[PDB]
Design an enzyme around this catalytic site. Sequence first.
Site, PDB file in Angstrom:
ATOM      1  N   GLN A  19      41.132  21.574  40.533  1.00  0.00           N
ATOM      2  CA  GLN A  19      40.081  20.476  40.076  1.00  0.00           C
ATOM      3  C   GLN A  19      40.398  19.199  39.262  1.00  0.00           C
ATOM      4  O   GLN A  19      39.669  18.142  39.508  1.00  0.00           O
ATOM      5  CB  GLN A  19      38.920  21.087  39.622  1.00  0.00           C
ATOM      6  CG  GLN A  19      38.848  21.597  38.237  1.00  0.00           C
ATOM      7  CD  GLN A  19      37.778  22.200  37.431  1.00  0.00           C
ATOM      8  OE1 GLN A  19      37.002  21.635  36.782  1.00  0.00           O
ATOM      9  NE2 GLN A  19      37.160  23.236  38.224  1.00  0.00           N
ATOM     10  N   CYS A  25      33.837  22.179  39.003  1.00  0.00           N
ATOM     11  CA  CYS A  25      33.925  23.683  39.085  1.00  0.00           C
ATOM     12  C   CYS A  25      32.921  24.143  40.072  1.00  0.00           C
ATOM     13  O   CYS A  25      33.049  25.074  40.751  1.00  0.00           O
ATOM     14  CB  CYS A  25      34.230  24.440  37.931  1.00  0.00           C
ATOM     15  SG  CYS A  25      32.277  24.028  36.853  1.00  0.00           S
ATOM     16  N   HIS A 164      31.394  27.549  32.694  1.00  0.00           N
ATOM     17  CA  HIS A 164      32.332  27.420  34.214  1.00  0.00           C
ATOM     18  C   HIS A 164      31.956  27.968  35.364  1.00  0.00           C
ATOM     19  O   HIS A 164      31.692  29.136  35.248  1.00  0.00           O
ATOM     20  CB  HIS A 164      33.649  27.494  33.483  1.00  0.00           C
ATOM     21  CG  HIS A 164      34.811  27.169  34.435  1.00  0.00           C
ATOM     22  ND1 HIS A 164      35.163  26.062  34.896  1.00  0.00           N
ATOM     23  CD2 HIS A 164      35.862  27.982  34.959  1.00  0.00           C
ATOM     24  CE1 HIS A 164      36.322  26.051  35.575  1.00  0.00           C
ATOM     25  NE2 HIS A 164      36.667  27.303  35.838  1.00  0.00           N
ATOM     26  N   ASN A 184      39.447  31.246  40.250  1.00  0.00           N
ATOM     27  CA  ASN A 184      39.237  29.682  39.410  1.00  0.00           C
ATOM     28  C   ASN A 184      39.814  28.542  40.145  1.00  0.00           C
ATOM     29  O   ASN A 184      40.073  28.818  41.464  1.00  0.00           O
ATOM     30  CB  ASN A 184      40.181  29.962  38.072  1.00  0.00           C
ATOM     31  CG  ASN A 184      39.483  28.874  36.944  1.00  0.00           C
ATOM     32  OD1 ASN A 184      38.622  28.228  37.315  1.00  0.00           O
ATOM     33  ND2 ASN A 184      40.333  28.757  36.059  1.00  0.00           N
TER      34      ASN A 184
HETATM   35  C1  LIG Z   1      32.754  22.536  35.697  1.00  0.00           C
HETATM   36  N1  LIG Z   1      34.190  22.181  36.024  1.00  0.00           N
HETATM   37  C2  LIG Z   1      31.973  22.386  34.524  1.00  0.00           C
HETATM   38  N2  LIG Z   1      30.683  23.186  34.698  1.00  0.00           N
HETATM   39  C3  LIG Z   1      29.613  23.127  35.352  1.00  0.00           C
HETATM   40  O1  LIG Z   1      29.454  22.364  36.067  1.00  0.00           O
HETATM   41  C4  LIG Z   1      28.607  24.268  35.032  1.00  0.00           C
HETATM   42  C5  LIG Z   1      28.467  25.251  36.137  1.00  0.00           C
HETATM   43  S1  LIG Z   1      27.990  26.808  35.623  1.00  0.00           S
HETATM   44  O2  LIG Z   1      28.671  27.088  34.301  1.00  0.00           O
HETATM   45  O3  LIG Z   1      28.433  27.777  36.549  1.00  0.00           O
HETATM   46  N3  LIG Z   1      26.484  27.142  35.435  1.00  0.00           N
HETATM   47  C6  LIG Z   1      25.484  27.081  36.849  1.00  0.00           C
HETATM   48  C7  LIG Z   1      24.350  27.737  36.578  1.00  0.00           C
HETATM   49  O4  LIG Z   1      23.485  27.364  35.426  1.00  0.00           O
HETATM   50  C8  LIG Z   1      24.281  27.530  34.185  1.00  0.00           C
HETATM   51  C9  LIG Z   1      25.514  26.378  34.418  1.00  0.00           C
HETATM   52  N4  LIG Z   1      27.063  23.711  34.892  1.00  0.00           N
HETATM   53  C10 LIG Z   1      26.903  22.620  33.540  1.00  0.00           C
HETATM   54  C11 LIG Z   1      26.086  21.355  34.214  1.00  0.00           C
HETATM   55  C12 LIG Z   1      24.923  21.549  34.975  1.00  0.00           C
HETATM   56  C13 LIG Z   1      24.084  20.501  35.376  1.00  0.00           C
HETATM   57  C14 LIG Z   1      24.712  19.109  35.089  1.00  0.00           C
HETATM   58  F1  LIG Z   1      23.767  18.176  35.670  1.00  0.00           F
HETATM   59  C15 LIG Z   1      25.682  18.972  34.363  1.00  0.00           C
HETATM   60  C16 LIG Z   1      26.375  20.053  34.018  1.00  0.00           C
HETATM   61  C17 LIG Z   1      26.396  23.210  32.532  1.00  0.00           C
HETATM   62  F2  LIG Z   1      27.302  24.431  32.098  1.00  0.00           F
HETATM   63  F3  LIG Z   1      26.373  22.298  31.489  1.00  0.00           F
HETATM   64  F4  LIG Z   1      25.169  23.732  32.751  1.00  0.00           F
HETATM   65  C18 LIG Z   1      31.656  20.814  34.399  1.00  0.00           C
HETATM   66  C19 LIG Z   1      32.585  21.700  32.986  1.00  0.00           C
END
Ligand SMILES: *[C@H](N)C1(NC(=O)[C@H](CS(=O)(=O)N2CCOCC2)N[C@@H](c2ccc(F)cc2)C(F)(F)F)CC1
Length: 217
Positions: A19, A25, A164, A184
């Site tokens: 990525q 992710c 993540h 991953n």
């Molecule tokens: C990935 N490179 C990254 N994380 C995320 O995008 C996470 C995905 S997660 O931790 O699998 N998960 C999905 C189910 O709900 C809880 C979180 N998601 C972020 C996020 C969600 C929405 C948004 F508009 C922005 C970010 C978070 F963990 F904050 F909820 C970016 C580092």
Amino acid sequence: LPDSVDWREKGCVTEVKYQGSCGACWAFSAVGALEAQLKLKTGKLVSLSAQNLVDCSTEKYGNKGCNGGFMTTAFQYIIDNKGIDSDASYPYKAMDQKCQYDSKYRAATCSKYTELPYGREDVLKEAVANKGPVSVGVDARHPSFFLYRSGVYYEPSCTQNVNHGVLVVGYGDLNGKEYWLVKNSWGHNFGEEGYIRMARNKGNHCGIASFPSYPEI
Ligand SMILES: *[C@H](N)C1(NC(=O)[C@H](CS(=O)(=O)N2CCOCC2)N[C@@H](c2ccc(F)cc2)C(F)(F)F)CC1
């Protein structure tokens, strides 16, 4: 249920992706899950476009492209959009771009998705065994995670606050340690060629079973 599962053995897992500096992710986790279902339904293993999700499954789905998103809403986008392009036709650039989806490049579809009950590792085991790879979120904020090289990952400081998105492609036991086999998206240099074996049945370690979901075709 079988004591062990590894979907790579059934040819349902594409090559590990990188990525880069784009927080996609969630997009890689989502396409990874659908790629297995596509293989199970058509017999063809095809990498799907994570970029397609980054550029198109945006505000309406509560996602922020290179700044994070949800696997479940990504699945709903694919359902609403009636398709997702192949990785080859809509390549990953690790940046936010204008939506460039085109049905002439459609490589997969989605009819629905399922979210598993919170923190239930035996329900997750059942889904991995009977349905296929499952998208999950884990707490990968700890220094030890970045430095993981082999064995079964166990971090005393892990929490259930996941940040993540990754993909569970199997499970089993190594030298007495039950584990979840996780794909991953930090390239083949990370962990064991892109994978990490995370502690299983150890109190929902790192929140691996907190928010699991899988798509269907
Ligand atoms: C990935 N490179 C990254 N994380 C995320 O995008 C996470 C995905 S997660 O931790 O699998 N998960 C999905 C189910 O709900 C809880 C979180 N998601 C972020 C996020 C969600 C929405 C948004 F508009 C922005 C970010 C978070 F963990 F904050 F909820 C970016 C580092």
